[PDB]
UniProtKB/Swiss-Prot annotation, chain A:
Cofactor(s) essential for the protein: Mg(2+)
Null allele phenotype: Cells lacking this gene show no defect in their capacity of forming biofilms.
Consequence the record notes for mutating residue 136 to A: Decreases catalytic activity rate by a factor of 2
Positions of GDP-alpha-D-mannose binding: 15, 36-38, 65, 83-85, 102, 125, 160
Effect of residue 98 to A: Abolishes Mg 2 binding. Abolishes catalytic activity
Job of this protein: Nucleoside diphosphate sugar hydrolase that hydrolyzes GDP-mannose as its preferred substrate, yielding GMP and mannose-1-phosphate. Can also hydrolyze the pyrophosphate bond of other sugar nucleotides such as IDP-ribose, GDP-glucose, and to a lesser extent, ADP-ribose, ADP-glucose and UDP-glucose. Shows no activity toward Nudix substrates FAD, CDP-ethanolamine, CDP-choline, NAD(+), diadenosine pentaphosphate, GTP, UTP, ATP, or CTP.
Pfam families in the record: NUDIX (PF00293)
Keyword Hydrolase: yes
Protein name according to UniProt: GDP-mannose pyrophosphatase
Highest taxon above the source species: Bacteria
Occurrences of domain Nudix hydrolase (ranges): 41-164
The reaction(s) this protein catalyses: GDP-alpha-D-mannose + H2O = alpha-D-mannose 1-phosphate + GMP + 2 H(+); GDP-alpha-D-glucose + H2O = alpha-D-glucose 1-phosphate + GMP + 2 H(+)
Annotated Gene Ontology cellular component terms: cytosol
Amino acid sequence: QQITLIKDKILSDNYFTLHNITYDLTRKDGEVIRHKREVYDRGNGATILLYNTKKKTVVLIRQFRVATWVNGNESGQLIESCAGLLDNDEPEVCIRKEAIEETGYEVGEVRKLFELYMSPGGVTELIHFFIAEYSDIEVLELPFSQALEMIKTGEIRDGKTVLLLNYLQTSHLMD
Amino acid sequence: QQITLIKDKILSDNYFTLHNITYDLTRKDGEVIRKREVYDRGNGATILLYNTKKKTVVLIRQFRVATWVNGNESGQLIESCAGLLDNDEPEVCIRKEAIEETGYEVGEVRKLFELYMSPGGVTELIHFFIAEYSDNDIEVLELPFSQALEMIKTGEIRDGKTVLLLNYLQTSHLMD
Ligand code: NA
Ligand code: NA
Ligand code: NA
């Protein structure tokens, strides 16, 4: 219930900011218990899945991700849905803009899905999720069903990407 | 194809490790292009406990500072059961987290896949699991599966791994 901020210690502020936050929780009859956690703030982002109900395909993005490279992704290439850190603007604008610039497709009306914390134990990151129809950074158009199999094989292994493809499966918008 | 690590600068070593990594990447024709923050908090695992007979799932509600400083007013977040890997196989680890967090013991565990949650600057790889359960400052939540799906729509559940497990559970037909 009651949370009190005790200390905000900056551990690094190179570009993003890492904090050690000292804080106090009250247990029931407080019984105030002190905790101290690292918190990483890279701001919030948005992501969008592009899909074609006609030829039954989706558009996805492949690029080198260094944080995967030093942690078991041998070549470091990661297949992901289009995405980007939010700039100083409404989320709906930034994502339209990422989609054009990363994929080269012009995108119609977007649909807002939800806003999710992707890794809330130590990162603040909130992502806004969107889907839309459509008609170096490697641009992959591939059939929906191949994308879905790629999940099962481990070839797609990006949390937000799997989440989107799964959402799209259950939407039946591809049915 | 060619990747060369040029410099691993440690920006923080308080507990987890924040690196600044300078790396050369080679393109198409041998154009060598040269820096990014990489945060290493180790890997984790998560699990969705479900019960096919009562059509319920178990989740967890806890305070999360990282959300508290970023629009989760009360800091409480409803998540699937989860934890950072110890030095052992993921499945062993998650069996422990599930019992130590929920009190419901589990037999079968099914591994779904391993996903990077925030790959643009976090190395974290989460190992996903489901398992059916029974009995026979962390609040354990037993809820109707359909209630849980709704809560994604209402926004009462707003956590990446939890949504992905729930949607997964829906697609599997285990709960039809
Ligand atoms: Na859905
Ligand atoms: Na460096
Ligand atoms: Na990025």
